[PDB]
Amino acid sequence: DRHITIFSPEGRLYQVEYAFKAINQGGLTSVAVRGKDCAVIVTHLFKITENIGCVMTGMTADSRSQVQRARYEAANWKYKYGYEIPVDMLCKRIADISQVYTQNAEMRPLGCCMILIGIDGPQVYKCDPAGYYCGFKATAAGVKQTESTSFLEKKQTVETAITCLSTVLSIDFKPSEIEVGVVTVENPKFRILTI
Amino acid sequence: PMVTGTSVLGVKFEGGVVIAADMLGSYGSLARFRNISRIMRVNNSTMLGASGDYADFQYLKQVLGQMVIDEELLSPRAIHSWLTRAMYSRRSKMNPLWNTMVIGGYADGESFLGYVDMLGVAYEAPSLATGYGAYLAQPLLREVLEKQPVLSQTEARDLVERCMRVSYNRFQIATVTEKGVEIE
Amino acid sequence: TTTLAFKFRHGVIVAADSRATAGAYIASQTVKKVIEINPYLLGTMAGGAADCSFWERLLARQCRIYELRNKERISVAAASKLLANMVYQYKGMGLSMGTMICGWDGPGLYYVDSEGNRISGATFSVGSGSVYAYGVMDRGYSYDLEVEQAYDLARRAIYQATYRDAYSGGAVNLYHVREDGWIRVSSDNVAD
Amino acid sequence: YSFSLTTFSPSGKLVQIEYALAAVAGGAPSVGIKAANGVVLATEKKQKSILYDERSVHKVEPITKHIGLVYSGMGPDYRVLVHRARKLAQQYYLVYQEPIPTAQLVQRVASVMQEYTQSGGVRPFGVSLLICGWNEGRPYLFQSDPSGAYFAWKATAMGKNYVNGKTFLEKRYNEDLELEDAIHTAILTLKESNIEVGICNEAGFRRLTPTEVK
Amino acid sequence: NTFSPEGRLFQVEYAIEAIKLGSTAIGIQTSEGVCLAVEKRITSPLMEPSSIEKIVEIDAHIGCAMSGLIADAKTLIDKARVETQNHWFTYNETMTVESVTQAVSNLALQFGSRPFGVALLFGGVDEKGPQLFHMDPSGTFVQCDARAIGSASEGAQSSLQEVYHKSMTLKEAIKSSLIILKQVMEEKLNATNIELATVQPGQNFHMFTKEELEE
Amino acid sequence: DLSASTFSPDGRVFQVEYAMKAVENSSTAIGIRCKDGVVFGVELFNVDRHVGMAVAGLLADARSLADIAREEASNFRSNFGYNIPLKHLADRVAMYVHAYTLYSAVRPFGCSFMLGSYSVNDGAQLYMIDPSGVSYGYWGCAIGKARQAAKTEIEKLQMKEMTCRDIVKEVAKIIYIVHAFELELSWVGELTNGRHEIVPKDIREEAEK
Amino acid sequence: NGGTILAIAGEDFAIVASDTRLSEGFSIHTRDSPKCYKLTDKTVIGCSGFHGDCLTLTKIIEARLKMYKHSNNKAMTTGAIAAMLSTILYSRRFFPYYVYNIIGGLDEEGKGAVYSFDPVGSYQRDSFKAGGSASAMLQPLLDNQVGHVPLSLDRAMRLVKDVFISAAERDVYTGDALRICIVTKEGIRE
Amino acid sequence: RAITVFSPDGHLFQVEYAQEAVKKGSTAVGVRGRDIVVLGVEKKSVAKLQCALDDNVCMAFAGLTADARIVINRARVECQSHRLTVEDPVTVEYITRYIASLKQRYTQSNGRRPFGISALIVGFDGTPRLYQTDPSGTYHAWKANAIGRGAKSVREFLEKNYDDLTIKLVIKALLEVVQSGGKNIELAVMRRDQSLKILNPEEIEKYVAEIEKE
Amino acid sequence: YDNDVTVWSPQGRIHQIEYAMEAVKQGSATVGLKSKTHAVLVALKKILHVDNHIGISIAGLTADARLLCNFMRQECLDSRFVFDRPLPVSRLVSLIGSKTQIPTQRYGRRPYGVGLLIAGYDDMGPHIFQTCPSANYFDCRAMSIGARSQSARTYLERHEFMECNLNELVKHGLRALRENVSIGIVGKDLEFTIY
Amino acid sequence: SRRYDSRTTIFSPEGRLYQVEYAMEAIGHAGTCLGILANDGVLLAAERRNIHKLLDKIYKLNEDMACSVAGITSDANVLTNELRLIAQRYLLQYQEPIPCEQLVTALCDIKQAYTQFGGKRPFGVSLLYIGWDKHYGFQLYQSDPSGNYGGWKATCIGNNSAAAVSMLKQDYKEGEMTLKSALALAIKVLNKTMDVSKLSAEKVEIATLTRENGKTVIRVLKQKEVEQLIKKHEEEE
């Protein structure tokens, strides 16, 4: 009913939204900003490809499966084509396999929001356990995600992200708490900023 | 079969097993790898040398190391026994290994020296010499055995030190010792 | 490796020479070719020695599974047919033999070659020496035949075959499948 | 699993498919008109947070040289359905060597959506999608729905408030109308219920160019 | 599949209950010979009096009575015949009753789809002489001396308890089944209300003709 | 909620947690990352010669994960040559641990186990793997029954410059305070040369003393 | 490769004697090998043809007879081996085991058993058989002095012995030390 | 999933339900006439807008015919396959054994349900044989049997009463007990080597009218 | 509701495994003790020849005992063939844990509810190993399984058995069993045998 | 896992499968259809599901055989696909056009397999087969949505099948019809079944199967002819 992925009488998958609520209960609060020249992400940082990274947000265990799948597909791209998979193509493909969880009632949605960053200019894709992906301009996903989105809508890039996490989680950080990853025009190499 | 070393010897010393072998891995008339060490050291004592296509030695060196490494965290006779299973199984598909290996190991006062032919023929023998000494070294081994029926620490030692002079002289002289596992 | 068989009004007689060979060396002269499957029907062995044993062990097995399940006898027609099918599958594998199904049913003699040639005649000789065995066979054979005259005919025809075939030596081994079923009618010598 | 999650109700109704039709009732409105120069398809999409992108995932995805799709329903499901629709079209091109007839691609894709109303362990596709095409002398406007039932149309609407959108399409429009003129009824029927648009004509399938949508 | 909270499986114990709606069957072992016996289990009069069968051959030396779910029995029976002939083909000796029964026990609870309801009584005179192995549907075989299987069998078990004899004579042991089958049955036993089969030490297994049964 | 594929409405799968409870019952293992080496103690499995493992949670299941980890170390040694790094081993075994959580049919693991390895480049590494497939590095780990109860005394320790040599006694000491106690201890540090091995019996007897 | 096997049993003895040496081509490699491995107090099996196969075959025979010994908990009959081994040879026949094996298990009747084999399976109870390389040399002679004897054992030992003296100085693949394994009711008598 | 798991009763659910499913079938009377077999069925439910497995074996299934043909097809493949393996044709008994084994199989299976038919397999050997087979996989020889709706009452009608005369039995059971139907009834005598042969309704009037005289 | 093998109890562990323990109790008792000379199975008639020097004693349902045992024989032959030595007992017991492991971890597959006592002669000195219905097995100085073993265990705290040899062991094994006697002895002098 | 499975192959304690009963009831939701045999040809009237203005069931199984699909549309297409395959495979190896009775048995085998095993939903769609097999001439068959088939001289299926087929019981006289009488009765019953007294051209469409000059041809009626039959209807009223 609300246990096997099937439609409710409202035409709504229950298990999918449960997976969104599981992302919110993952307790982490990721934000990314697409500058013109740089693509900050902040929170679980990953290097899916040397030119591509992403931050999963949700269930901790669940993140690693889709990280490995992302590396599998990203590597397989270059194997059949021979150029970096675009951030759009990678997010598209991972979204396409997250739908498989939803189409099949056997297996369950992995609750991890996937904020990709990387230059194809800079890209900030979102992915949901729904199988929905879209390019945002300044995404955030997590617990205080809505409270951050307002501050993003109101809106140096690194500052946007860090002041956003500071103001929105309403806490002054330690540098170890905020892991930050930048992908500058000149640095297509995924790299943790290291404030 | 691709590049092939030859000339592996083995023979026991009372409380030890000398096994010497030269270090050539010739491919055709050319001696392409005048650097290969063919005497793997299996266990705190026991060891295999190999004389046949070297690719097969690499395969069985990493695979025999798999069996020993597994079992350790779970005897020469056993290694030869399985080795006969491995050489045999590859023969059954007619995809053999070209390796012919002597397995010298001191086990409980007994110097087992197995010989495993590529086509899976197997026996223990006290004075084993694999190819090119399987017609040349072999009488030199026996001539000592025709006279004295056993060989001492010093006897088999000097026997191999001379017999290897009877390839190139660069041979490593592995020596199982009551302890086991030496190489010179 | 000669195994004559013929049927007449008082039986089906199946005689066989006992020599078996590898090269021009003769390993033994003791084999009884007419491998048993059934009290009242019997096999033969021509062609390679191991093949006939094995196939007729499978045959004996399948005839037994059949007689238990169907709860009736397997017939010479059916027995030869299951046999013929089973040897066909191994056609091109060189599993060569000249087994024959014999037995009283009227009498049934069906020659069964390894390539699947299950033919029903009445008069056969199978094997290397068959060409010798045939010529003697026709000359005495009549359906009007006594059990004794037929015994002599089987023995003469085997005796004349072994006399010329280098690879066939050993004693004649009659089995007579009369109405009731087979008996070891003679195992008697050729060196008489 | 191996057991289908589609089973009849006591009077013979496919409950899960009916619920899939409820999922079609959601999703932003779609609209499509066969005019006589060429079909147009258009859909509401929204800024929503004002941080979105509009060229990222069009609901208007070309499928084949002159076919396109517009969906209403769940967006995630569309992304894979399109993939199989393109598969059928390219596969058809290597076997038959002509871009596949509009009616045939709609049929084959309908069969894909039918398979899950009989297939184990899978739910039916929520997405319903207009499939608009033009071959030979005719513009084709099709509607595939969750059960894999499909219909050709002269004008049709999907998503939220299709119920009134179709009503406008039968009175505000009929017969024929020059392609932008039959886009007039699109932009004004869609108005009853940001926006993406794509047109067909005979000029290679096309997204109505953004300066001219304005 | 579910081990009950009280240990033992469900479907098996339900299969044991299925035996209770199966024919009564004495499994006499005389040390001379084997005497498997079973009530005809006929109830319907235009149902044939000589085509209904309860006891089947396996080898020439092993008979096999059955009880419980009659249809289910024939699968395990046919596979037992295949096993015995396979033994003959590989080793030329006939398969002894202990292993003939064991092979069938191996297949008994292989449901990873549902357990057989059959109780079986192999009787085969093998070099040891008479042997009589009962087989439970729990995948348990047990050597026996006298076990009677089926529905009124519990009373046949206890009746057997007084009359079981050290050694035993072949004909006398047969008479025991002929008397006990009148008790366990509701009707007065008639030779068309039993199908007896016996194996004397020297003979190959014989279904018993009816005329002999009246005596 | 009772089947693994289903999510409870709030945001978790309760099956995984019920499987987690199993290690909350079983008695404390305690490994301690140290200036060199990880002294596993559990009031042990040679995963590889390189790697040691200290299981907690029901033992039956724990052995299968041990055997898979031995397989994983061997496939890595064959395909790549070089002895497996623990930072990759943890992640691989943890991935395999994770797969169960995702499908209804197989049950989540009961175990949680700290594998550890001293190696030259990495130095000591002490990773614990949860039955969820969440593996993290540690400076100390202690899991089981006395779960935070052991953690207060490994917090009392300050290994960062404690030698492995104090720790071989200290693990047993922490075991004694949180705890009759059968004692087990392991040394993997550079004196043991990365050979996963039980403590020498005299020091182990002294440690219980 | 090859080498000679011989076996005779009349009365209780099943004298399975064979030369030790194996020759890979001509390079006699060990002069100490037995061809007549013992399997059971009664079972002894000569194996000539191909040593590499002989090893593998006898290990398969030993494994299978132990499986039987578990499966029936009854000792493996010599007659069971005669019917069993032939099927084992047939199992790998399209790639065949180049092996000629002579069986010597002690019967239930306390008598000798000899079972000749070929590479595809021809078990033969017989009063004697020699297989292997020198078999052509030994069969007519050995047949003549053995085939109204009560199977005299002392003269029979000399008769087994002498023919291998004769084969060894005639055929170049029979030689060195002779190993004999009589099988009597007291057990195998190596 | 195991379907026919044992009840706590010791019964099998699907099997007993299948026993009640053949009871809804029509009254497939049969009797093994000493001369020749005769069999027949009834209740065609004529709106007026409206088997043989061998030349020996024939079948008169009762139950749900939807399943019954599907059983007989596999049975017919089994007949012909047997004629190629043994030289002679299949005996009626061997057919009955296979059909009974085939029906048994689906109870012990994943996802299957017992075939709801109970076939009156019939056939010459030249002695008549008149088997019943029931969903359980039990097969019993009979000399009279009738399976169907009200057929049980007919078997009892036979029990107290048991070419023209065997046909009189087959008619009498139906034209006395079941509703009188000169077309509903379709008896077919099988002659010794003539294939099971139906009659025209007027030829059936040999007793369909003579019973009106009796 | 934990009537499935896969399911874990909110309260605790898988209930089918626990119910498999109770499956052991309807089978008759069997006692395993040992001395350095000989291992001692005593079974209240169940002893089987697993190997020429190993024998199991079943308790519980017979079916699972034979299934495990048919595997045991093949596994004993594996070590005896591949490596040419007797199988060491402890390794075979480790295989029992591996084969019993699969049902507990999987669905639709019930546990091997037989409890076994694998006595064997061994080169480290004879060992006996109980294997419980879960994979878990125990090295032990002495042990008892089956019905009423608790009385039999109680006798053993006061018990001498590692010193006194096989005759006296068995004399006391019968005394332990009182708390119809098959006996299974193996030792350095003699192969496993069913007295 | 399998705890969800509702079986849908189960056998019920009332002794009649669930999905089969539900399949019968699905068709009642399906719109009216009827086929009428004659001694020269076989008609198939069918009613276009709604008259809806802006939308711009019978199929070609062969050129000598055709089907009407009633119960549902999405499933029907797969049925028609399988019918075309079976027919054209039979035409492939036997090299003669499939006899129609056979083609029906084949599809009904495929249907029956869905009830019998696999735990998959059955096709709920009753079909008609109009055709002219070589061996029997013109024939019409109806496929129940569980395996069955019944050669019928006239039959209706869809909404009010019962009233319509019962109306044809007495209104279809046996063995007298020239094709003209088939058109008359067709138009009658389809007229009487709807609450609309007469029917519009966007309601009926009639595939007449006619032996066209020694080459049998199926033809959907051309709408101008559909309206002469309807225009005749207005005066038949």
Residue numbers in the entry:
A (entry chain A): 10 to 52, 68 to 144, 148 to 182, 193 to 231, 235
B (entry chain N): 4 to 77, 84 to 175, 183 to 200
C (entry chain L): 1 to 105, 108 to 194
D (entry chain B): 5 to 197, 206 to 226
E (entry chain E): 13 to 124, 134 to 236
F (entry chain G): 8 to 50, 66 to 201, 208 to 237
G (entry chain M): 8 to 154, 163 to 205
H (entry chain D): 5 to 54, 63 to 137, 140 to 176, 184 to 235
Any passages from the paper?
We determined the structure of the human 20S proteasome core bound to the inhibitor adamantaneacetyl-(6-aminohexanoyl)3-(leucyl)3-vinylmethyl-sulfone (AdaAhx3L3VS)12 by cryo-EM and single-particle analysis. AdaAhx3L3VS is a highly potent proteasome inhibitor that irreversibly binds all the 20S core proteolytic active sites and can be modified to serve as a proteasome label and as a reporter of proteasome inhibition both in vitro and in vivo1216. The vinyl sulfone class of 20S core inhibitors act by covalently modifying the proteolytic active N-terminal Thr residues17. In the cryo-EM map of the 20S–AdaAhx3L3VS complex, densities are clearly recovered extending from the catalytically active residues of the β1, β2 and β5 subunits, with no analogous densities visible at the non-proteolytic subunits. The density extending from the N terminus of the β5 subunit can be used to unambiguously build the L3VS moiety of the inhibitor. Here the vinyl sulfone group and the three leucine side chains are clearly resolved and arranged on alternate sides of the backbone in an extended near planar conformation. The remaining Ada and linker components of the inhibitor are only partially resolved, most likely due to conformational variability, and were therefore not modelled. The density extending from the N terminus of the β2 subunit is also consistent with an extended near planar conformation of the L3VS groups. Better visibility of the inhibitor densities at the β5 active site suggests higher occupancy compared with the β1 and β2 subunits. On the other hand, in the closer to physiological conditions used for the cryo-EM sample preparation presented here, where the human 20S core was incubated in solution in the presence of AdaAhx3L3VS for 1 h at 37 °C, the inhibitor binds to all three of the active sites in a manner consistent with the results obtained from the in vitro activity studies using purified 20S core.
